[PDB]
Design a protein around this nucleic acid. Structure first.
Ligand SMILES: [Mg+2]
Lengths: 70, 29, 172
RNA sequence: GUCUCGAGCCCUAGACAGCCGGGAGGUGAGCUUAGAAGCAGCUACCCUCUAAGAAAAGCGUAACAGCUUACCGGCCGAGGU
C-alpha cells in the first residue's frame, strides 16, 4: 500500500535524479527528525520490532545515493 | 574448540537463564 | 576387512560355493560373487563379506559386493521398476510385447520391426504411451530397460531433429 | 593403476560427500534507460529479521519468471582434505 523508499526521499529533498557515483558526489540532505517521519509510515514493509532499527533500514538507501545527514 | 562455538554456547546459556548439539551443550550447563 | 549385512525378515538367503541365491515374495535372484581372497558367507541371519587383504583393489570389490547384495534384498521385496515414455513426432510408433520380447513397429516409417529380447524374469507392462519395466534382478531389469531405449538408436541422422523413441523417465 | 613415506589444515562442540529443509525483508539498490527488477553497462556494495541468506557465484528470460551457488539448519556417523 505504502510507496517505495526511493520515492519517499525525493519528496522531502527537492531533488529528482540521484548521482553517477554515491557518497563521492553529494546530492540531497535530510535531518534527524526527517528520518523519524519515514520510520512511522513503514510498519508492515519492515521486519524490525523497534523504531530505532526501523530508521537504520531507511539510512541503508540514503548514504548510497548522495544524501548527507546533519 | 573454535571460538565462535564457545561464544554461541554463551549466547544460548544467556537466553535459557532469562545447531542441536550447541543447545544440548547449553542445557547441560 | 569385514562388512556384515543384516538380512530382512521378508528375505531368506542360501549360498552354494561362490553363488548366492536370495529369495523373497517378489522372486529369486542368484548371483556369482567371485574375486581373489574375498569370502562371502551366510552367518545365519547375516551375510558376511570378508578378506585378509585391505588394498585399493580388494576394497573396491568389497563395496561392489555390498551394493549387489543390498540390491538383491530390495529386489526380492519391493522390486525394481523403471518407467519409460514413448515419444513420436510424425510416425505413429507401435510398441508391443510379443512373447518374451518387446517389438517396436513403424519407427520413423520403417517397414521392418525392431525388436529386443527381455532378460530373465523381467516383466514389461504397457499402458498406451507409458511402459514399466519390472523385476527382482536389477541387472536384468536395468538392461531390458536400457535395451528398449538403445533399440531406437539413430547414428545416421541428427538426434536433435529426429527425437523419436522410448526414453527412460523414472530410475529407481 | 597400485604400493610406501612426509608435511599442513578440518573433525563426535559431528568433519568430507550425499539427501531433505531454509535460502527471508527494506527494495524491483541508484545511475543509465521505453525497460533492466543478483546476473547489458557504470558506481556503490549499505542494515533489519535471524539459525542462515550476496547491492548475488553460474545458467536461464525481450524484461520478469524459473534453476540452483554461496551461506544456515536436519538426517547420517568417522575419518576427511
Ligand atoms: Mg548427413
Amino acid at each position: 500500500g505504502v510507496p517505495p523508499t526511493a520515492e519517499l526521499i525525493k519528496d522531502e529533498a527537492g531533488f529528482e535524479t540521484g548521482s553517477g557515483e554515491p557518497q563521492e558526489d553529494f546530492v540531497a540532505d535530510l535531518s534527524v527528525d526527517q528520518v523519524k517521519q519515514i520510520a512511522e509510515q513503514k510498519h508492515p514493509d519492515l521486519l524490525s520490532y523497534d523504531l530505532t532499527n526501523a530508521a537504520k533500514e531507511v539510512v541503508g538507501t540514503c548514504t548510497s545515493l548522495g544524501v548527507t545527514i546533519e | 574448540i573454535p571460538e565462535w562455538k564457545q561464544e554461541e554456547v554463551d549466547a544460548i546459556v544467556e537466553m535459557i537463564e532469562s545447531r542441536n548439539t550447541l543447545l544440548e551443550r547449553a542445557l547441560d550447563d | 576387512p569385514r562388512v556384515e549385512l543384516e538380512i530382512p525378515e521378508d528375505v531368506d538367503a542360501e549360498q552354494d560355493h561362490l553363488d548366492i541365491t536370495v529369495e523373497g515374495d517378489n522372486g529369486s535372484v542368484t548371483r556369482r560373487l567371485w574375486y581373489p581372497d574375498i569370502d562371502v558367507s551366510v552367518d545365519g541371519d547375516t551375510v558376511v563379506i570378508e578378506s585378509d587383504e585391505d588394498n585399493a583393489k580388494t576394497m573396491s570389490t568389497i563395496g561392489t559386493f555390498q551394493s549387489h547384495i543390498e540390491n538383491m534384498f530390495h529386489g526380492v521385496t519391493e522390486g525394481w521398476e523403471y518407467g519409460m515414455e514413448v515419444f513420436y513426432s510424425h510416425f505413429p510408433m507401435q510398441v508391443n510385447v510379443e512373447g518374451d520380447e518387446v517389438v517396436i513397429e513403424n519407427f520413423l516409417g520403417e517397414k521392418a520391426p525392431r525388436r529386443t529380447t527381455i532378460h530373465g524374469d523381467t516383466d514389461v507392462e504397457i499402458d498406451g504411451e507409458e511402459l514399466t519395466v519390472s523385476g527382482p534382478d536389477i541387472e536384468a531389469v536395468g538392461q531390458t530397460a536400457a535395451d528398449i531405449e538403445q533399440l531406437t538408436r539413430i547414428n545416421d541422422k541428427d538426434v536433435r531433429v529426429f527425437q523419436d523413441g522410448v526414453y527412460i523417465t523414472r530410475k529407481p
